[PDB]
Amino acid sequence: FVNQHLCGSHLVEALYLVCGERGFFYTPKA
Amino acid sequence: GIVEQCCTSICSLYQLENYCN
Numbered sequence: 001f002v003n004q005h006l007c008g009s010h011l012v013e014a015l016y017l018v019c020g021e022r023g024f025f026y027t028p029k030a
Numbered sequence: 031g032i033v034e035q036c037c038t039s040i041c042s043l044y045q046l047e048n049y050c051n
Binding site (some may be wrong): 010025027 | 032033036038039040042046047050051
């Protein structure tokens with residue numbers, strides 16, 4: 001699920017699944 | 031940033047993990 005174009009909610013979902021209990025930061029304008 | 035790496039281009043696990051806390 002990571003090796004594709006991931007945008008918007010799809011990208012946030014991937015970060016969520018990958019990062020697990022560490023959580024993540026989503027900074028689309030940085 | 032992440033949009034350039036994962037949305038506009040093909041994402042990767044390597045790159046996604048760069049944004050984990």
